[PDB]
Coordinates of C-alpha atoms and ligand atoms in Angstrom, one line a residue:
Chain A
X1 CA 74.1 11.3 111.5
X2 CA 71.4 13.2 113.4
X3 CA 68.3 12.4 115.3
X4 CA 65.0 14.5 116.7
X5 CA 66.4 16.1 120.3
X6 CA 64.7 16.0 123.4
X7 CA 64.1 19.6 122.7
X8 CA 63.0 21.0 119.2
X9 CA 66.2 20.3 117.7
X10 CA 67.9 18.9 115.2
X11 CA 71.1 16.8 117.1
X12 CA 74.2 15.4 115.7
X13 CA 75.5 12.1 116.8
X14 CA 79.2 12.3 116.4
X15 CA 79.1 16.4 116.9
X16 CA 80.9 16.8 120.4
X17 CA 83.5 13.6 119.4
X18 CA 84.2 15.2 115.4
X19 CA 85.1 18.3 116.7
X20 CA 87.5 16.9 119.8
X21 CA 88.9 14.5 117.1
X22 CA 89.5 17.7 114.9
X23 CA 90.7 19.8 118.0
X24 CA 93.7 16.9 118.7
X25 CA 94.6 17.2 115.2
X26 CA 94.9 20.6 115.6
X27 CA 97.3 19.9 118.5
X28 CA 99.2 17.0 116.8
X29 CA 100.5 19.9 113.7
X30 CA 100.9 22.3 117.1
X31 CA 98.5 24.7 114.9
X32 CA 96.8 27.6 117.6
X33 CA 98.1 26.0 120.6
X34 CA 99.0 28.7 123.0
X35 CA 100.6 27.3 126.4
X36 CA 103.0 24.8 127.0
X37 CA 103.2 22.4 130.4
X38 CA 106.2 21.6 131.9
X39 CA 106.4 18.7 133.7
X40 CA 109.9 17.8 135.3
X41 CA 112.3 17.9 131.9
X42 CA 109.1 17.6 129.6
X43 CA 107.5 20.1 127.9
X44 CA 103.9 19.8 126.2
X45 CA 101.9 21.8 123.8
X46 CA 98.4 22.6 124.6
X47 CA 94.8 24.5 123.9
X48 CA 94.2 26.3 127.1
X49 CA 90.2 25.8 126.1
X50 CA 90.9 21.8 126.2
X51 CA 92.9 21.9 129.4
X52 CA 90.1 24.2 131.1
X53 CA 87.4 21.6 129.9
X54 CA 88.8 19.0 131.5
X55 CA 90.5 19.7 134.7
X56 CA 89.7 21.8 137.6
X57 CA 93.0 23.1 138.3
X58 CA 93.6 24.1 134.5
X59 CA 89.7 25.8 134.9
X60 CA 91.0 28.0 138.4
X61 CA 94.9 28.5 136.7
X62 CA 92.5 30.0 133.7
X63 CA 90.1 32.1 135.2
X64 CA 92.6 33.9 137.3
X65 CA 93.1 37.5 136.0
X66 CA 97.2 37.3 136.8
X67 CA 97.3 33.4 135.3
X68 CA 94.9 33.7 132.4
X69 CA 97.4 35.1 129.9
X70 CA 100.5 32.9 130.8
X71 CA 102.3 31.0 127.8
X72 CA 104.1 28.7 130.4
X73 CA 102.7 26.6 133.5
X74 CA 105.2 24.8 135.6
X75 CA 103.6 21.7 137.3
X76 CA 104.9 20.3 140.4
X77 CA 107.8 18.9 140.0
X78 CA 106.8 15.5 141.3
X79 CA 104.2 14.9 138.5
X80 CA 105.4 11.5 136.7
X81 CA 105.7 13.2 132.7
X82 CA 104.1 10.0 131.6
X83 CA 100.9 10.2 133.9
X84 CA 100.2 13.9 132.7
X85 CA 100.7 12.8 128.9
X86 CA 98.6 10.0 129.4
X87 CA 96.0 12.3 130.6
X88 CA 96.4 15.2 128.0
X89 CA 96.0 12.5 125.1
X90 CA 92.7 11.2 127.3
X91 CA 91.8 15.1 127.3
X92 CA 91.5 14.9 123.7
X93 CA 90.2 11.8 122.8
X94 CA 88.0 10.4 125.4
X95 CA 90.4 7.2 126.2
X96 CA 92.7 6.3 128.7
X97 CA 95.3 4.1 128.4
X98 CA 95.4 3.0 132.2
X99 CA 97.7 0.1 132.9
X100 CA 98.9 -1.4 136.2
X101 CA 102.1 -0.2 135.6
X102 CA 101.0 3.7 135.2
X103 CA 97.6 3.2 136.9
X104 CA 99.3 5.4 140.5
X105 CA 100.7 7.8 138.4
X106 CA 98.0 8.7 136.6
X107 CA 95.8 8.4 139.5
X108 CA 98.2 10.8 141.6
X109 CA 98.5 13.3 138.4
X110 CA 94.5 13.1 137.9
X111 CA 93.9 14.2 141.7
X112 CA 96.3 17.0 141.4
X113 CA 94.4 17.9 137.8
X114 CA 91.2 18.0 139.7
X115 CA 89.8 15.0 136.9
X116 CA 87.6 14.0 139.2
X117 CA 85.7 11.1 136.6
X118 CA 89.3 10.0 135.7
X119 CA 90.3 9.5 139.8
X120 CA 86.9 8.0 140.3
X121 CA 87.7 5.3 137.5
X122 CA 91.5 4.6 139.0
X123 CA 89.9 4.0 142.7
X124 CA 87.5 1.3 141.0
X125 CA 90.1 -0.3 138.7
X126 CA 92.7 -0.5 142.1
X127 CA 90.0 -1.9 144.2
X128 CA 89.1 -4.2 141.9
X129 CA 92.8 -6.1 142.6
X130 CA 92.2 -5.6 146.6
Chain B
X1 CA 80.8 6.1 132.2
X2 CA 83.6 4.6 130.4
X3 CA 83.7 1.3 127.9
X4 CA 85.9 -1.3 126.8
X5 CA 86.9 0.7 123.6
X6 CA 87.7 -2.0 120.6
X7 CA 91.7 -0.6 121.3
X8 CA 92.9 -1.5 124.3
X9 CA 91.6 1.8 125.7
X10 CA 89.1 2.5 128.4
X11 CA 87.0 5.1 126.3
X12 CA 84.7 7.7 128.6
X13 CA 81.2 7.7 126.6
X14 CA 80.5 11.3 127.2
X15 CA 84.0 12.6 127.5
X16 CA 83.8 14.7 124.3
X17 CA 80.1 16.2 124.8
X18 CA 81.5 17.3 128.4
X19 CA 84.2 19.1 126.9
X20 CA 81.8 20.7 124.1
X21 CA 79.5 21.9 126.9
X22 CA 82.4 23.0 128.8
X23 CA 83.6 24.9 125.4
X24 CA 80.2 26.7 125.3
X25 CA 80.0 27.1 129.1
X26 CA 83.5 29.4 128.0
X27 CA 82.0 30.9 125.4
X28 CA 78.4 32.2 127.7
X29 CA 80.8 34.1 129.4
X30 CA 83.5 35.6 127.2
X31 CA 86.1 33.1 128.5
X32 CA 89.6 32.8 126.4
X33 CA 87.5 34.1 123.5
X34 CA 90.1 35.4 120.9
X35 CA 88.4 36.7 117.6
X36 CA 85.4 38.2 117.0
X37 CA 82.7 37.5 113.7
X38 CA 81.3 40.3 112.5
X39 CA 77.9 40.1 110.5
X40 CA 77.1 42.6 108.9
X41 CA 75.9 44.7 112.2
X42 CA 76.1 41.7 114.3
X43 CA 79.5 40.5 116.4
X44 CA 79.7 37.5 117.6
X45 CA 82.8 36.1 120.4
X46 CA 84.1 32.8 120.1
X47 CA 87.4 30.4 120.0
X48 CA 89.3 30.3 116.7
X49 CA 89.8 26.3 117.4
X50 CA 86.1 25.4 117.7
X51 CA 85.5 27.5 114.3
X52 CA 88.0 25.7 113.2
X53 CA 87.1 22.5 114.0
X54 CA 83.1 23.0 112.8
X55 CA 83.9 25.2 109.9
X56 CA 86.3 24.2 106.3
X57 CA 86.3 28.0 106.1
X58 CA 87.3 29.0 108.9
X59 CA 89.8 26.3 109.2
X60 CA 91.4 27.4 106.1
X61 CA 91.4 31.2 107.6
X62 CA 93.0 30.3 110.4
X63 CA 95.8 28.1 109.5
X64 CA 96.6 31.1 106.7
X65 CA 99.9 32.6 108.3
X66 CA 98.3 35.7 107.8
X67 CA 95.3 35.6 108.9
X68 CA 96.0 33.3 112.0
X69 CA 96.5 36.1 114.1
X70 CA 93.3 38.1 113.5
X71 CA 91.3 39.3 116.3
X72 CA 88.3 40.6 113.9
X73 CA 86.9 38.3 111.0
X74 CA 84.2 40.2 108.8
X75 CA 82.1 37.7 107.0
X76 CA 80.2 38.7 103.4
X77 CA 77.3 41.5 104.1
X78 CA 75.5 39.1 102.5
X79 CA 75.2 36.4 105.1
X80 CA 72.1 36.3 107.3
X81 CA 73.0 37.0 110.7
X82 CA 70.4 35.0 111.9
X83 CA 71.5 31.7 110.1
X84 CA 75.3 32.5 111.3
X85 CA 73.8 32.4 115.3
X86 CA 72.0 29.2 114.6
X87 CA 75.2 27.6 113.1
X88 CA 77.8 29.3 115.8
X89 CA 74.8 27.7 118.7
X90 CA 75.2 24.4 117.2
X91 CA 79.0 24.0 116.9
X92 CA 79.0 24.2 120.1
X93 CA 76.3 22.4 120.9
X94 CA 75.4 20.0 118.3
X95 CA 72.0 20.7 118.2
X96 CA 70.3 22.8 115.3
X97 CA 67.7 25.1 115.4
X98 CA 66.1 24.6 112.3
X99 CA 62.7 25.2 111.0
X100 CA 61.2 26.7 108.4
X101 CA 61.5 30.3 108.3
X102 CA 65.1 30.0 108.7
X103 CA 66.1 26.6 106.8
X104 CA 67.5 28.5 103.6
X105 CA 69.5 31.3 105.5
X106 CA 71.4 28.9 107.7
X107 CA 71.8 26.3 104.3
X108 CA 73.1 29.4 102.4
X109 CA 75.4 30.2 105.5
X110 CA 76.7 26.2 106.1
X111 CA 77.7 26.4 102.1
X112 CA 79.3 29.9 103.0
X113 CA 81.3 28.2 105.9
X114 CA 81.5 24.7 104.5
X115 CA 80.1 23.1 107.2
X116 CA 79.3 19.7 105.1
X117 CA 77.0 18.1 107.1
X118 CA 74.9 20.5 108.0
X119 CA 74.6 21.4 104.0
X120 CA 73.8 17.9 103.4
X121 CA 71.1 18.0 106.2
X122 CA 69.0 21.0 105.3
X123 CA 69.5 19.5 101.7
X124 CA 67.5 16.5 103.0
X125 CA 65.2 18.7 105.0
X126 CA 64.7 21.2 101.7
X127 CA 64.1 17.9 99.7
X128 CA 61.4 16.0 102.3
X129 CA 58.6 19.0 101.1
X130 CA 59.2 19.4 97.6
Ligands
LIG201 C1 80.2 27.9 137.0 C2 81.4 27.0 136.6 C3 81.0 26.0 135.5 N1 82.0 25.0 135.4 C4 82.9 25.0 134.3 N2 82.7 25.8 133.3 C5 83.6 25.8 132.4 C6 84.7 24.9 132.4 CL1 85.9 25.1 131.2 C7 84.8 24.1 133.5 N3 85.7 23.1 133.5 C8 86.1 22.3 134.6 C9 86.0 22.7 136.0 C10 86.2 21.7 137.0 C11 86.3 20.4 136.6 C12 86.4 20.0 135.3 C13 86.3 21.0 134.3 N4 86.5 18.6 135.2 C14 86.3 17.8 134.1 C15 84.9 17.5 133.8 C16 84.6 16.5 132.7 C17 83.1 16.0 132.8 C18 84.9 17.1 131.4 O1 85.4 15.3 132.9 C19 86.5 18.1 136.5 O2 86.7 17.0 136.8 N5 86.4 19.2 137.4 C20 86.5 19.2 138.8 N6 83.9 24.1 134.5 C21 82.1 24.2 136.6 C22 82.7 25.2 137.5 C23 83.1 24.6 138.8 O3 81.7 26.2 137.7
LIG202 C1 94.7 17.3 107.0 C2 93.5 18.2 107.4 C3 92.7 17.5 108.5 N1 91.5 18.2 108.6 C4 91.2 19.0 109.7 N2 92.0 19.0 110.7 C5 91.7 19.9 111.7 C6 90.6 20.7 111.6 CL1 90.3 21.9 112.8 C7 89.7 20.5 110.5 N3 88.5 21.1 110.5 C8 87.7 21.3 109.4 C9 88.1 21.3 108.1 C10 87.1 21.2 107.0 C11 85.8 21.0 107.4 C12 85.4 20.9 108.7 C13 86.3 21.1 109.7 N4 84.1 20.6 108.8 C14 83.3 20.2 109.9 C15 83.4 18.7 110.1 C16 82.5 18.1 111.2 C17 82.5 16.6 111.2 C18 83.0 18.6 112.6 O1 81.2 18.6 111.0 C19 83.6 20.5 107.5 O2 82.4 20.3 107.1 N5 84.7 20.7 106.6 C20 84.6 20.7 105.2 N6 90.0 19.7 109.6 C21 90.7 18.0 107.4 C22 91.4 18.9 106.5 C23 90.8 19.1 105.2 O3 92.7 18.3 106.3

């Protein structure tokens, strides 16, 4: 459960991974979630804290004094719905269900997310077809 | 970076520790902080879903439909404000500053919060003098 830090603390394990588990299963009842994405016809239900940790353009839309207290974000309206949920259930729970069939969609939605670890791993799984 | 996950899943090994530290990078600088915990003098900004997510108490404050809204949350004057720092540090950190002079402040304040596995700890750290 926990294990003498690098530092003079006490560190927990599972920690960081409990509390994402605990933070998607906050999402899943829809409990404190306070924007919504739209994407195309879809609509998705979101912690803007989650979103900010993992994307750049979420971080920026965020930050900005005007955008910051927005309860809607339109995304452009050619980002494949699938690709984005994909990457909201990686954003909160560490795994990505990348298959050839959505692997360009995802790929296309992560670059326009600024996920720059998720666009990294689509460029090595597509080269390694090539 | 990423795994074979036992699911079919490529899982990202430090996915949820870079979100945690992205949480706490948030909270350093008052970032889509909604409620402040007051201890006794003390306040202390933070986001209701990591609370949530670390804390049985504060989970069960904030999915009251009353008290989900609150922007102030006073704790019991009784709480060491102190112990409540070292606790709020390591939700969203996982580390834990504890030592000596402070073990049976933050135990007393983990019980207060129900934060299990911290109890459990300093119950193992209590037990390892006696
Ligand atoms: C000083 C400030 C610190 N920082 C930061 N702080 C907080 C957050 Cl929410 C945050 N999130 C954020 C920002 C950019 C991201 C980002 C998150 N992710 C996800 C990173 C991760 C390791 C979680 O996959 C990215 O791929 N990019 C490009 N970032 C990086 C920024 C540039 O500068
Ligand atoms: C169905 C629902 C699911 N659940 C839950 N869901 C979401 C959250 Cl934010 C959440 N957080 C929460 C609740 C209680 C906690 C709690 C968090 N922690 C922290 C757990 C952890 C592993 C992160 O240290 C505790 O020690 N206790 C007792 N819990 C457990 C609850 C009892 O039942």
């Amino acid at each position: 459960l926990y294990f003498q830090g690098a530092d003079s603390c006490i560190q927990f394990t599972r920690h960081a991974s409990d509390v994402l588990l605990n933070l998607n299963r906050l999402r899943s009842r829809d409990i404190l979630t306070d924007v919504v994405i739209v994407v195309s016809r879809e609509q998705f239900r979101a912690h803007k804290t989650v979103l900010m940790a993992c994307s750049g353009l979420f971080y920026s839309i965020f930050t900005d004094q005007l955008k910051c207290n927005l309860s809607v974000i339109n995304l452009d309206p050619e980002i494949n719905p699938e690709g984005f949920c994909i990457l909201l259930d990686f954003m909160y729970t560490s795994r990505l269900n990348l298959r050839e069939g959505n692997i360009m969609a995802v790929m296309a939605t992560a670059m326009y997310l600024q996920m720059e670890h998720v666009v990294d791993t689509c460029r090595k799984f597509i080269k390694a077809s090539e």
